[PDB]
Amino acid sequence: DRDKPAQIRFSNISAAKAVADAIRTSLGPKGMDKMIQDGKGDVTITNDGATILKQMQVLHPAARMLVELSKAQDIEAGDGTTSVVIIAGSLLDSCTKLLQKGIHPTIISESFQKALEKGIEILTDMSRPVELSDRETLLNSATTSLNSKVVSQYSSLLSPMSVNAVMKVIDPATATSVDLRDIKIVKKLGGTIDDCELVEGLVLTQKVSNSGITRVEKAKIGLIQFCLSAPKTDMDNQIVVSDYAQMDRVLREERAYILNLVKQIKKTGCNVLLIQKSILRDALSDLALHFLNKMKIMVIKDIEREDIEFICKTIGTKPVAHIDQFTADMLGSAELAEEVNLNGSGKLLKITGCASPGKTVTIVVRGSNKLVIEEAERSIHDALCVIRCLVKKRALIAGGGAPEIELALRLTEYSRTLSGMESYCVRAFADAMEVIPSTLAENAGLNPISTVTELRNRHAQGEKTAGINVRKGGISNILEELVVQPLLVSVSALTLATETVRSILKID
C-alpha cells in the first residue's frame, strides 16, 4: 500500500509551503525585508527571497527542491525569482484538496502539465508582440520594466548601454535566448557610473611586463599551459645546498631549456600571452619571462583556470598546452591590444576587438569604491536579463499580477468546457493562480480579497481596465501607468513550479 508514502507526501507538501510562506511577505517591490538569523547566530537584513533560500534553509527534500526552483529561475531569467517561490506553494494548496478528495497524484501531475501548456497558450494571447531587431523598441521595453523594479537609480543611464551590448549579438530577428557566456563583467576600481561603458573583445586585469610592449597593433593572443621549472617535493630548487658550485651547475642548466621554449613563442608569432596562476602550476620562471618580455611581447600573469576557459571560447583562442600547439587557430587575433591606466583608479588591459566567433561583448563597471561598483553590477545584470528574457520570448506582457487574474479566469472557464475527472484539478490549478497577486495585494496594502475580485471585474468585461500598481500602491491599470515585464519571467516562473509539483506528487 502507498499509505506510508501517503503520509510522507502530505508532510512534504506541508513543509515546502512553510519555508515558502515567509516569501509571501517578501513578495514584490513593496515586499518585506527578511532579517536572517544565521546558523552560528547573526542578523542579516535580506530581501529577494531566492537569496534567502540560498543563504538560510533547512535540510528537507521538499525544501531542497525550493532552492533548486529559484536557482533555475536565477539562471534562465534571474527575475521573477520571488514569484517562482509563491506559485509552487500555491499549487500545493490545490494538491491538498484533491488528495483529500482521493485523486491519484499521477492524475494531478498530468492535469497540471496539460494546464501548464494550456495556460501559457492563453497567456500568450494576452501578451503583445514587440520588436527584437529595432534597437529603440528594445530600449522602451526594457527600462519600463527597469523602472518597475526596485533599482532604477542607476538603471537609467545603464539601460541603453545594455541595449547596445545585446544589439551586437542580435544578428537575427529570432534573436536567441542569450549566452551570458560571452558577456564579461569587469570592475574598474575608480571611475564613475557615468564612465561605465562597453569595450569589445575582453578586458583584462593587471599585466606583468618585464620589458614587454604596452600597445601592440594586430596582436596574437597566446596561451601558456606549461611549467618552466624543476620538480618539487619540499623545495622548488631541490638542492641539499651548502655549496656554491652545486647551486651554479644545476641552475644555469635550468636557464638553458627555458631559453629554447621562449624563442618558440615569438617565432610562431605572439603578442599577448595568457598566463594563469603559479599555484595553478608549480612555478613560472620570471627570468625566462624577462627574456620573453625582452622579445617584445605583452604578458598578463596569474589568472584563474576556469576563467581562461571563458576566454578560450569567447575570442577563439583555443587551448595551447605546449610548443606544438603554437598554431594559427589556437592563437587569437586581436586588432589592437593595450592597457588603459587612466580614466579612473587602477589599470585594466583592453583587448579592443578580437577574431571572435559571434560577438564577444564586455562591460567595464566603474565607481568610486567597491560598494558603488557593486551597485552598478546589479544595475547592469538586471538590465541584461530583462533584455535577455524578451529576446527569448518575442511578445511582451504587462506585469503587475493582473495576467494571473486574467488567466485563472479563463482556465476555470475552459476546464468546465473541456471535460474532466481532472477538470477539478485544472479548476484548482487556476485557484492557485490568483493567490500570488493576492499576496502581492497584501504588500501593496488595500485589502487583497477586495482587490483580487475587482481585477477580474475588469478582466471579465473589458479584459483588463484595472491592475495592481505599486506606484499607486493599489488599484490602477498597468496599461494606464505602464508596468510591464518580459514574457519569459512570467512563464519561466510558472513552468518550473509545475514541473516541480508533478515530481513531488510522484515522489513517495
Partner: protein, 509 residues
Amino acid sequence: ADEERAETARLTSFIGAIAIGDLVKSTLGPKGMDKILLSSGRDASLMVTNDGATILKNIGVDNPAAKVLVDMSRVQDDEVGDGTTSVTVLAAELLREAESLIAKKIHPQTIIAGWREATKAAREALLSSAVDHGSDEVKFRQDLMNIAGTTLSSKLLTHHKDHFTKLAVEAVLRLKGSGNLEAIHIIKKLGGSLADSYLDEGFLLDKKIGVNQPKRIENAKILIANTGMDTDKIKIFGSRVRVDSTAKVAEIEHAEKEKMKEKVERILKHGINCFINRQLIYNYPEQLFGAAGVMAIEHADFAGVERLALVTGGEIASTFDHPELVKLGSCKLIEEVMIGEDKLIHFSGVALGEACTIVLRGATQQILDEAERSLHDALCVLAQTVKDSRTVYGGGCSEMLMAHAVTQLANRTPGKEAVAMESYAKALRMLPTIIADNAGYDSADLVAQLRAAHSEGNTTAGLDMREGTIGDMAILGITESFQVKRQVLLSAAEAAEVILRVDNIIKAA
C-alpha cells in the same frame, strides 16, 4: 549468534521484502510514481528516480529476504536488461499471497509445490502468447519500434526518446538473424543536442586528426595494433637496460632513433593506409605516416581497438608479438565528418554489415549518461529479439491470460498443492493493479474488466494505460517483448520460493 525462528522469520520476511516491493511498484510505468533517494549514510544527497535498481544502490538493503531480491534484481538488470523493477514487485506480490496461507496454518512446501507447477503451466500459456514478427521485414520493422518505446520509457527517458527510437531500430535491423552487442559500438559524446545524435554504418573513433594524417581513405587496409614508439617493446633491436657503468648512455641514446625508424619500415611493409595505435605516436614517425598515406591514431580506446579487429576482420598485433603475421582489416570508406562540435572518424563500409555505431549527443552530462544506460538496456533486449522475433501482449494483458490458465489448472488439480495455485493466479493479477495505480485508476475496475476479457478469450486487446482504456495489442507500443517476461516469470517465482525456504535464519553479525 541470533537464531531467528520461523515465527519471527515470516514477520521479518514480510516486512523485509514487501516494503521493497512497495518501492519498485511506485517507480513502475511512465505514468507511475517516483522515489526520492535518501542516502543511508551521512550528508544524504537526493535524486528523484523512476528506477528501482538505483534505489537498491543508494539505500542499503540489510533485510535477508530483500537481500535475496538484490541478487534477483541484478540478473534481470545485466543479463536481461529491462525487467528489473518488474521482477522484484512480482515476487512481493507472491509473498503477500502467501500471508493468508501462513495465517491459516499452511506449510510453505505446500506453497512452493503449488507455485512450481503453476509457473510451468503459465510458461506454456506464455508460449501460447508467442507470436512471430520476423515473418515479414515490415512486421519485424514494426516489431522493433514497438519495444524501443517500452524499455526507454521504463528507464527514465521519454522526452527525446523518439529520436533515439528511429536510430536504434535501424542498427538492430542490420544484425539479421544474429543478436550482436560487439557489432553495435556505443559512443557517448558531449556536444550537440539530442536531435543531433547520429548512426554510423560501421565503426567510429572520436579522434581529431585533421589534415596532418590521411582522413580520406578509400579501399582501406586496417592494421589493428598496440605497438608503441618510445616504449621499446618486445623483439629487441638494440640496447637493453644495464647498470654499473657511466659511458653506456651513448648506445641507449642512439638506439631510440633506430627503433622509431624501423617501425616506420615495419608499418609500411604491411601495405596499410591506416595504422591504429593504442599508444602515443611520436612526432617523427607521425610525420612519416601522413606523407605516404598511412593514418596515425594515438590514444586509442582500450575497448575500441578490440572491437575494431572484430568488425573489420582484422586481428590485434598482441603488443608487437606479431610483427607481420597480424592480419589486416578492410573497409570501404574512411571519412572525417564533423558531428556536433567535434571532428569524428567514421569507418564506413566495414566487412560486417551487422556492425554499426550509435552516436549519442547530449547537451550535458546529466542527460548523456542516463540516455546510454537506458539505450544499453534496450539493445540487449532487441538483440534477444533478433534470435526470437516474438512478442507478448503487454499492459498486463498476458498477465490476465496466464492467470486464467493457472486458474483452469487450479480447478482441475487441487489437492494439497493448488491451494498455492489459487494464490498464484491472484499475484499475476496483482501486477495489472499496479499499472492501473501507476496510471492512477480504479485497479479493481480495470482488472475485473480485463478479467472479463480473457475469460471468453479476448486476448488480442488489453488496457492501453495512457488512458487506462482497453486497446489494441500484438503491436501497440504497449505490446511488450517475449524475451523479457519469460525471464521475469522465471526469477520472481524462483526467489520467492527460496524466501519460503529460509526459515532457519541465523544472524551472527
